[PDB]
Structure formats: C-alpha cells, structure tokens
Design a binder for these strands. Structure first.
Ligand SMILES: [K+]
Lengths: 71, 71, 82, 124, 105, 88
RNA sequence: GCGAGGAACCUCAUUUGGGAUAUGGUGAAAACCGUAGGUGC
RNA sequence: GAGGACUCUACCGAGAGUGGAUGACGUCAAAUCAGCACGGCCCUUACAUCCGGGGCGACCACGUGUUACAAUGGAGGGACAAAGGGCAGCUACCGGGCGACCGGAUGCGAACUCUAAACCCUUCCCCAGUUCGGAUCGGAGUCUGCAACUCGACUCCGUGAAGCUGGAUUCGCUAGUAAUCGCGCAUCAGCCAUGGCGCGGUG
C-alpha cells in the first residue's frame, strides 16, 4: 500500500474541478477517492470509453480505476 | 614515510616488463553470451577479462594499458 | 469449553489454542505469554484460575468466532456490493 | 622443535606441528574432542597414529576451508607425512593402509546449457 | 573404508546401501540404533555375528552380498513401523529366525 | 532501432538533466502536492538503457554500453581492449 | 524458463482519442493562446 | 619472518589422466530483413510523427520447472565451519520498532563492508490430512516510483485448499558424478528471479 508518510494520492486538478463544481470526464484512473468527491458523477476513461461513476460514501478510499473495467 | 606504487593492467607480461615486487591476486571476470543472434540458446562461449595488479614500495623516498596509483 | 469450542484435551496448549477460528500458532503463543501459562503442559492440566485467565485474555481484545465470521461475511458482502 | 607437514583435501588445508608429548591434540586453539564431536571424525584424524604411536606425541593443528569431512581427511594426510619425517622406516606401514596418497578430486565446474555438471535438461 | 565402531568394511558397505540423499551419518545412526535394538529386544552371539548370520540366511560373491543387502533393506522399508531402525531390527531377528516375507524373495 | 526512439531518449535525458535539481529539492522535503506538477518526462524513471550504436533495448551490458551480440562481435574483432577468449 | 540476461508509466512495435506537420490562460498530456523516415513485405 | 596464501619460472614415469575449447569433413531452399548492413516492391494529408489512457498479465491441451504428499521427518533451544562473487553503493555502531527498514552517525571506489545451510547435541510431536502441506481469500502496513486498480516486491494477524508416492509410456548420468544443502552474479528505481550463469559443503 501507499506509505502513510506520503498520505493519499489525490489528483490536484481533478480535486480542484470537483471543489469548483454535470459529469466530469477524467483519465485519472489511479486517483484515490476523497470524501469531497461524494455526490458527484465522474466519467473515468477505460481505454476506449468513459464509464460514469456516481460517488457514494462506501467507495471512499478506493482508486477511481477500480470502478471502470478495461477488459 | 614511504611511497607505495600500485600498477594494474590487463597483461601480465606488460606489467612485469613495466615494473623494471609483491604480486597481488588477479581479478578475473567471465562473460557468458549466446553464440547465436536469435533464439538458439544452450550454445554459449566464455570471454575472460583479467586485471593484474602489482605493488612496490620505496621507503623514505610505461606502455599504454597500465594505470599506476602512487600513495 | 473455553469459548463455545471443546478443545482436544490431550494436545499441548500452544497447539490446542489454534483450534479456535480466530487464533493461529503465533496468536496462541502470544496469548499464553500474556496469560502467564506454560506452553508445555496439556489442556487437561489447567487449573480453573489458569483457564479463567486464558479466557479473559481471549475476550476483550480478540475476534475469535461468531463475531469474526460475521465481520468477514460483512466485508465479503461489502466487496460484492462494490 | 616441531616436525612440520601439510595436508590438502578438496578446499581444506591442514597444518601439523608434531612434538614429543602425551596425546593432547589441539586444533584451532580448541581440543580435538570439542572441535570434532563426531567419533567418526576423531577416528579419521587420529588414524595413522594408532596404525604405528599415539600417547607419545603432542600435536597442534591449524585448519581452514572446506567442511568437517574435508578438514578431518586433510588433517589425516598431514599427520601421515609428518610421521615419515620422524622415522624413514615407517613409510611402508602408512602407504599400505593408503594414508600418504593425496586424493586430487575437486568439485567439477558447471558446464553451460546444463543445470549441473553432468546433468542435462529433460528432453522428452 | 573402515567402520567407525566395528572396523569391518561390510558394515560400511551396508551403510552405503542404506544411505539416502547423501546423508551418511544418518544411515550410520540408523544402523547402530537397529543393532542396539536387536540386542535390547529378543537376543547367543553378538549383534554383529547375528547380523552376519541373517545376511547369510537371506554368481560372484560380491554380487551375492550386494543383492542380499539390497533385498534386506528393501523388505525393511516394505514392512510397517514408525522408526526405520525399529523396523529394520525386525528384519534382522526374522532373518535369523528364517521366516517372513524377506526370506527367499 | 529506429530514429524516433533515439530522439525521444535524448529528449528525456535532456529534460531529466534540466529538472534534476528541483525534483531533488522537493523530494528531500515532504512536498508531494507539487512533486506531481513536474512533467512525467522529467522523472528519471523513464530512462531505458539502449545500445549506444545499434539502439537495441535488450541484452544491455553496463560496463561497455553495448548489447551481447555487439560485444561478441567486437571481442572477436579485438576492438574491446583487454577482453579475450577463454581457451577452455 | 526462447529473441527476453528485468512489459505498472518508458521499453512498445499493438488498440482508442487529442495534436503538430518570459509569463498567463486553456489542457489528461502533447500542444495552443495573449501580453530523410518505416520494428512495412 | 617464510609454515601457508598470493603470482612468475624449470623437469615431470620406460618402468615396481580428467573436464573444456579448437571442428579443414557436412545436408537441411534449416533460423535470423525485429541485433546490424543490404538488391527489389510499397507507404508520404500518412504504413511518417508527439502525447495521455488501455493491451502484451483476460480463460481447455501440451512442454519446462518449484513445493509437497512426511519419523532417513516437522517444530523449539544451543554448538558448527566454506568457496567464489558484488560494494555511490554496501554498511561498523546507538536507539522508534513484533517485523519488513527509518534516523542519527562510521569505514570503504576494495587480499572497510553483504557468505552459509544441510550437519552435532537437548526437548516436544507418534502415524493423525496431523505441530505434514502451504493454494486461495480477508485485514493492517514498509519500500521504490509523479503514479502499485487493471498490473510490483516484502513484512505482520487471521483463513486455512488439493495432495496418502503417481497407469500405458518416458527423461538424465557412470564419480567429488547423480541426489541433496546453502551462497553469489548479469540485466535493474522496484520487481514477477521457482528462470539463466557460477561457487562451494556430504556424497
Ligand atoms: K527502467
């Protein structure tokens, strides 16, 4: 896992877009979901499509690419 | 006070002729590569690269390929 | 016996404590050291005070059975719902 | 002072200093009964002394390299040639039992294309 | 090669036959334990003489000795038991008594 | 092989050498919300060791900087100083 | 258990999409904005 | 100060060798245009070129291996003594730590630093799918790296699967050899390394 000395890996641009916020498209598959994301529609790239994800409190703490299969 | 001269090369005759001496143990490296340029494994040949070192001392006070350290 | 489980009496304690769902060999050794019981005598050769100490060490700080099964099943169900 | 000899067996070199005394074999600043706790290993090292001579010599041995069977066999060879220096009439008594001959067998190098020296991969 | 306790090359050859995996002192210990058990349980002559008589009870003479030792070891492995020496002692006593699945097999 | 491979390798080396100071300054401290603002090419993790002349990215040797086939060629040709062929 | 004796990004040739042929702002990045080559046969 | 090491020379059975490399002598239209050059053809508003995000890792048959299926054994506690090869990286020593290694410091660009296990004693297990086995899955973390979801390694705590020595057939060798036990290196930020290349113990 990611070491606690570094903290969570949240993409700064995606976090800024969510805080300033419609479905938000992104390629940040390795971004960790933060509690501020809850209640938002994030369309994650998967290789050829943008799978939409509605963020709920249960998903907090998981990478955004876990809810968008590639194969 | 003393001066120590350490010679080192890759040719024993060359260092022996250069040093006008305690003989230090040699450093022999062995490289193993595939004879073929493609999938044909199990056919290998060995290339040896040797380093010969000599030490001399002068108490109270060269061909190419030899490096000499004076201390 | 000890907690909902009847251990094999003839076995030594440090291996007979592994028959509970939440305890392995290392947890058994740790619990024996914490309760001060030797790891050589059998389960049958336990005083009531020794058994009470072992039971109190097991409780209030360990998930053993029933609760552990419910927690594992809840985690599996949450992962499935994910 | 001390009759000197050397023995080699695999990657193990033994040095012997045999002086007049009463037993008391010391190896690497340690007693022979505590350095080699196996009775087979003590029988190999003290073999040529019993063949001819024990309880009449004090022996100090320095060992380096190899394992316990390599060192014990190397130590036996060193003692065997040290006894022939003390008396030239003891040579046939030691060669007949096969003690002065050095065994030159060492671990063979691993050839390429094979997992071991003479072991080949399974073809099928 | 001399035996470490008895000084007979036949004992060394038998231990060589017994040897597994390159471990020779283990085979020596097994043989000596079996020779001790053959005297502790049952048991005339010494353990070494009893073992030699059992080998005789069980073509070049060297080949005969080798096949006798191999047969004795094979049937010792075949018979049941927990400790290998505890097993093998039964083969020595049974070959001395001239019976069992080992004899004439 | 190819030419775009070598061109982008040289570009990566140039960017890494350009940004080698600020990245170390940010890594020595605890800063990570700004360490992700550096371009991905600037990190030294995208630096493969290609052959110096042919450009083969496999079979690389660190001592000489050449692949195994090129090494055998030059060792047979005598171009590499010191390296000989074992008689055994 | 091979070219491969180091496929998370790079390697990478394969697929989808966006480009071109000093500071800001817009961008996932490339990039934008104002003040000969082929790892093709 | 010369018994070993280490590295230079000279003789070596007519009397009481081995391992490896050389391969004039070869046929397969055998393999290699993707190591590298190169005759011909085909791409230039794209088969050229830059970048993000995916794939090469998705799920029955064959080959090559690693663990086992256990008492010539597993566990716990003590005693052992190797050859070769690496070190801008390994690390002497003090403590935060259960542990992976972090945080202060010390030598070392190399006859200062990483190298044993199988063995030898003592005790438990006593034939049980077990104190055998270690697959799979849940939780906590430690690293590397901008980033570990697809898709890394390692360390703790649980969970504990098939597996009771394997039919027809078939593979490897003739001695420091098979069978075993550990150690090291190449590429490499990390690593899938149970692979490849070597080194020694007992035998
Ligand atoms: K790399």
């Amino acid at each position: 896992s990611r070491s606690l000395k570094k903290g969570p890996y949240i993409n700064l641009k995606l976090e800024k877009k969510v805080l300033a916020m419609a479905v938000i498209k992104t390629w940040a598959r390795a971004s960790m979901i933060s509690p501020d994301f809850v209640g938002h529609t994030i369309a994650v790239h998967n290789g050829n499509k943008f799978i939409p994800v509605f963020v709920t409190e249960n998903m907090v703490g998981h990478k955004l690419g876990e809810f968008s299969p590639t194969r | 006070q003393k001066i120590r001269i350490k010679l080192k090369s890759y040719d024993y005759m060359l260092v022996d002729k250069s040093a006008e001496p305690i003989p230090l143990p040699t450093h022999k490296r062995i490289f193993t590569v595939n004879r073929s340029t493609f999938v044909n494994k199990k056919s290998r040949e060995q290339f040896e690269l040797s380093s010969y070192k000599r030490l001399i001392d002068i108490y109270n006070s060269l061909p190419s390929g030899v490096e000499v350290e004076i201390k | 016996r000890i907690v909902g489980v009847d251990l094999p009496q003839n076995k030594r304690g440090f291996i007979a404590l592994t028959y509970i769902y939440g305890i392995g060999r290392s947890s058994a050794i740790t619990i024996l050291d914490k309760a001060g019981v030797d790891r050589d005598i059998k389960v049958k050769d336990w005083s009531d005070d020794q058994a009470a100490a072992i039971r109190d060490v097991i409780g209030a700080g360990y998930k053993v059975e029933g609760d552990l099964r419910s927690e594992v099943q809840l985690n599996i169900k949450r992962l499935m719902d994910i | 002072d001390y009759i000197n000899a050397i023995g080699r067996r695999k990657a193990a070199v033994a040095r012997v200093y045999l002086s007049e005394g009463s037993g008391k074999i010391v190896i690497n600043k340690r007693e022979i009964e505590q350095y080699f706790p196996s009775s087979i290993l003590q029988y190999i090292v003290k073999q040529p002394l019993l063949k001819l001579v024990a309880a009449k010599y004090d022996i100090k041995i320095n060992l380096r390299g190899g394992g316990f069977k390599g060192q014990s066999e190397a130590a036996r060879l060193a003692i065997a040639r040290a006894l022939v220096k003390i008396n030239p009439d003891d040579k046939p008594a030691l060669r007949s039992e096969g003690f002065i001959t050095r065994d030159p067998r060492v671990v063979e190098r691993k050839k390429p294309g094979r997992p071991k020296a003479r072991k080949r991969f399974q073809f099928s | 090669l001399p035996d470490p306790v008895y000084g007979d090359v036949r004992v060394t050859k038998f231990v060589n036959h017994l040897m597994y995996d390159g471990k020779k002192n283990t085979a020596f210990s097994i043989f000596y334990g079996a020779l001790d058990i053959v005297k502790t349980k049952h048991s005339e002559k010494s353990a070494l003489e009893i073992w030699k008589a059992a080998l005789d009870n069980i073509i070049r003479p060297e080949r005969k000795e080798s096949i006798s030792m191999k047969n004795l070891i094979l049937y010792a492995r075949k018979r049941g038991g927990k400790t290998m020496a505890d097993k093998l002692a039964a083969e020595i006593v049974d070959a001395f008594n001239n019976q069992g699945a080992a004899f004439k097999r | 092989a190819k030419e775009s491979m070598k061109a982008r390798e040289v570009k990566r080396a140039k960017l890494v050498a350009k940004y080698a100071a600020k990245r170390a300054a940010l890594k020595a401290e605890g800063n990570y919300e700004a360490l992700q603002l550096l371009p991905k090419n600037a990190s030294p993790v995208r630096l493969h060791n290609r052959c110096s002349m042919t450009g083969r990215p496999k079979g690389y040797m660190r001592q000489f900087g050449i692949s195994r086939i090129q090494f055998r060629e030059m060792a047979s040709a005598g171009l590499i100083p010191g390296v000989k062929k074992a008689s055994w």
